[model samples]
Target: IVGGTASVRGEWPWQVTLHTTSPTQRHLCGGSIIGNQWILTAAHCFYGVESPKILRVYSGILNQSEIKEDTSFFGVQEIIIHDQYKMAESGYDIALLKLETTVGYGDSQRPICLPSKGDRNVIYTDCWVTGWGYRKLRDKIQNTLQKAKIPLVTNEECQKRYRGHKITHKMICAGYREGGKDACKGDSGGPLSCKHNEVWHLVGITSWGEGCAQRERPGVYTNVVEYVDWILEKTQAV
Candidate 1:
């Protein structure tokens, strides 16, 4: 979350923290809890680390000022990255993690719903990007979860601003032209969702951006609607 306030308990329950054995349990990235045993994140999060066992997933917590007793930390069982995931071009950047054990769903912990198969061209306006990433560039990452209200930008509009990068169907853009709020480092793989009626749909997975809240470069995310088939295929099988 960029330019946001401290998250309330059960505010973003589906959000999960990706940790690795750096010095030991270092928070590496963010992810969305999509199912009992599946977490939707970015493939780039594991780009340098091929060893899946070194990763861990923590859910059911708002602040990590200290790991609470109720926080669920699950060891990584399997990492399923897309076949066409590329670090250089940063396309098809989504991935899934199979937890060693299933998470018990409740108010404090639950799965975010994917877009229905019939749903097409869901008009998203007041979307929010949530994460526990750095509050500002070159600053220490936040201990508590944060979120910012980011409006959806079209691919055509984003392509004009991000000339150096490609904005494909697999991706979507959000943030402002002036760039007040955006995803920063350690926020990668987090969810950028939009609430419709009363249900919140996972729209994007935080993929990349030029710089945190730069003048023109808004945050780019892996478009979740385009990959719903792929997600259900893996999540259902495992």
Candidate 2:
């Protein structure tokens, strides 16, 4: 994340790293653990990938270099992108990845709470985004997980910044108005979580943005609350 600090180990237990299933195993995007076998991420993260075998998930690790030593690397069994998802800018950027193995919930790894359907209209505060995304537009991805506190931007206000681009209700915006902090490259699919009643609820999934921490162009995300029903329907069968 741009303009962010390194995150503490175990601070973001729900955050997981998505990687290509190659010898090099490059980090592709970030995701959140919503269930033992279900991962919530952005659809665009798998844009050209054809098979679930090409993706892997690493949980409970804060440093990228420590992934090889981590015992939580998981293989993906199924990938379910939103049926209506067309492109990143058009919304419906969410996706779910079913893991081949069920993740064990512990102090360093657990599922994040999803906001209720009725909470869509609620304004959230104490929001934060965590990832291994780039600290700058052209820089390499961070070796350690990073996190930043960003305020939620109203759709009406965010639309004005994007001009012709419509900030639909399916999307949520968050960042500083002066453009100092935001989720950048490789941050897509990460969680935008807010604290409610002492629990962290997943509010958004990092989707897209004009540039890395640019003035008035806040990071756009898939509003998780808008798809609570769809998420339940998709995960309930398992």
* TM-score per model over all chains: 0.94, 0.97
Each model's lDDT? 0.85, 0.92
**Top model number, lDDT:** 2
Measured on C-alpha atoms, candidate 1 has an lDDT of 0.85
- Counting clashing residue pairs in each candidate, in order, gives 1, 0
For model 1, residues 61-118, the per-residue Cα lDDT tens digits are 7877656445558888999999988772468998999999999999988998897756
- Candidate 1 displacement at residue 138 in angstroms: 0.4
**Compared with the true structure, what per-residue lDDT tens digits does model 2 show for residues 1-238?**
9989998899999999999965567898999999999999999999778899988899998899987745558999999999999998999999999999999999999999999877776778899988999899999988999999999999899999898787899999998889999999999999998997788999999999999899899999998999998999999976
Prediction 2 TM-score vs. true: 0.97
Stretches off by above 4 angstroms in model 2 are 69-72
